């Protein structure tokens, strides 16, 4: 497959197939990788970076897929910045929608909580990463820290787990009584019925599955 990118030399440019009519520079043995987000080609220098950290990262350190943003800046509609240290990752203005169990009702309660106190999702992530670093909050990708270079999707995933733990350590008296009144769902946070408006509103799903 023939490949011409932003850092490709000018002779590669002119050699490509013509369209149909009605400080790097990639070497001959230079490969290209495809940014997972924007779909465009960049020179694949990941193996070189392995013994030359002077090279900008070109992959998420969790999923291990490649991304251009840190290398030379990505651009696409919906791309907030697809690679960053976790603590600086741009999660987008809508990162709190369904952030709790993909459950809008629960998410909204969290939203009101933060609005009421003038807190942003950034403030909340900042507190959360501090709990994480102490071992007070936990992650599935258990080795992730605020300094991890990762992607939009991976950061978001871990963001939801931190957020859940944040919501969890809010005291009942700091929430409206309409919220606290609701009884726990027997099936807890993983309940499948909570994506139906009526049920989400009727039961509290910030809880664990009932056993005994
Ligand atoms: Zn190139
Ligand atoms: Zn990733
Ligand atoms: Zn890109
Ligand atoms: Zn991107
Ligand atoms: Zn339920």
């Amino acid at each position: 497959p023939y490949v011409v990118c932003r850092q490709c030399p000018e002779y590669r440019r002119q050699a490509a197939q013509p369209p149909h009519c009605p400080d790097y520079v990639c070497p001959l043995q230079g490969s290209h990788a495809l940014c997972t987000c924007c779909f465009q080609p960049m020179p694949d220098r990941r193996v070189e970076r392995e013994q030359d950290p002077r090279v900008a990262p070109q992959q998420c350190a969790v999923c291990l897929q490649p991304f251009c943003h840190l290398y030379w800046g990505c651009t696409r509609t919906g791309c907030y910045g697809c690679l960053a240290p976790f603590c600086e990752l741009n999660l987008g203005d809508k990162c709190l929608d369904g952030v709790l169990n993909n459950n809008s009702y629960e998410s909204d309660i969290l939203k009101n909580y933060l609005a009421t106190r003038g807190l942003t999702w950034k403030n909340m992530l900042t507190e959360s990463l501090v709990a994480l670093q102490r071992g007070v909050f936990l992650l599935s990708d258990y080795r992730v820290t605020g300094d991890t270079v990762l992607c939009y999707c991976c950061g978001l995933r871990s963001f939801r787990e931190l957020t859940y733990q944040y919501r969890q350590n809010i005291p009942a008296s700091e929430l409206p009584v309409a919220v606290t009144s609701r009884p726990d769902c027997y099936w807890g946070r993983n309940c499948r019925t909570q994506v139906k408006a009526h049920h989400a509103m009727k039961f509290n799903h910030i809880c664990e599955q009932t056993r005994f």
Side-chain angles (χ1 to χ4, degrees), residues 35 37-38 68-69 74 82:
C35 175
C37 154
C38 76
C68 79
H69 190 73
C74 182
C82 48

mmCIF file of all heavy atoms in Angstrom, residues 35 37-38 68-69 74 82, ligand 3:
data_model
loop_
_atom_site.group_PDB
_atom_site.id
_atom_site.type_symbol
_atom_site.label_atom_id
_atom_site.label_comp_id
_atom_site.label_asym_id
_atom_site.label_seq_id
_atom_site.Cartn_x
_atom_site.Cartn_y
_atom_site.Cartn_z
ATOM 1 N N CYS A 35 -3.044 6.879 12.778
ATOM 2 C CA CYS A 35 -3.650 7.421 13.981
ATOM 3 C C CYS A 35 -4.999 6.762 14.111
ATOM 4 O O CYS A 35 -5.774 6.740 13.168
ATOM 5 C CB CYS A 35 -3.805 8.939 13.907
ATOM 6 S SG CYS A 35 -4.700 9.627 15.323
ATOM 7 N N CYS A 37 -7.455 7.683 15.732
ATOM 8 C CA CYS A 37 -8.548 8.628 15.894
ATOM 9 C C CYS A 37 -8.861 9.314 14.586
ATOM 10 O O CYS A 37 -10.002 9.309 14.124
ATOM 11 C CB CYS A 37 -8.219 9.675 16.971
ATOM 12 S SG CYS A 37 -9.078 11.269 16.765
ATOM 13 N N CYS A 38 -7.843 9.917 13.993
ATOM 14 C CA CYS A 38 -8.068 10.731 12.815
ATOM 15 C C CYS A 38 -7.875 9.953 11.508
ATOM 16 O O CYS A 38 -8.220 10.451 10.436
ATOM 17 C CB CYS A 38 -7.173 11.962 12.851
ATOM 18 S SG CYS A 38 -5.450 11.653 12.447
ATOM 19 N N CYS A 68 -1.829 10.201 16.846
ATOM 20 C CA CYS A 68 -0.904 11.201 16.313
ATOM 21 C C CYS A 68 -0.776 12.437 17.178
ATOM 22 O O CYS A 68 0.180 13.197 17.042
ATOM 23 C CB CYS A 68 -1.290 11.606 14.880
ATOM 24 S SG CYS A 68 -2.668 12.788 14.722
ATOM 25 N N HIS A 69 -1.729 12.640 18.073
ATOM 26 C CA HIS A 69 -1.881 13.965 18.663
ATOM 27 C C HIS A 69 -0.638 14.515 19.343
ATOM 28 O O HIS A 69 -0.282 15.668 19.156
ATOM 29 C CB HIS A 69 -3.045 14.005 19.631
ATOM 30 C CG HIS A 69 -3.378 15.385 20.079
ATOM 31 N ND1 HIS A 69 -3.993 16.296 19.252
ATOM 32 C CD2 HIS A 69 -3.162 16.020 21.255
ATOM 33 C CE1 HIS A 69 -4.153 17.434 19.905
ATOM 34 N NE2 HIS A 69 -3.662 17.291 21.125
ATOM 35 N N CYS A 74 -3.296 16.217 16.307
ATOM 36 C CA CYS A 74 -4.395 15.611 15.573
ATOM 37 C C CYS A 74 -5.501 16.626 15.279
ATOM 38 O O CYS A 74 -5.639 17.636 15.975
ATOM 39 C CB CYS A 74 -4.961 14.444 16.380
ATOM 40 S SG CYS A 74 -6.298 13.553 15.576
ATOM 41 N N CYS A 82 -6.488 13.535 21.365
ATOM 42 C CA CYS A 82 -6.659 12.101 21.598
ATOM 43 C C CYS A 82 -5.526 11.400 22.348
ATOM 44 O O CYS A 82 -5.573 10.187 22.528
ATOM 45 C CB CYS A 82 -6.955 11.362 20.278
ATOM 46 S SG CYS A 82 -5.847 11.757 18.883
HETATM 47 ZN ZN1 LIG B 3 -4.601 11.779 14.650
#
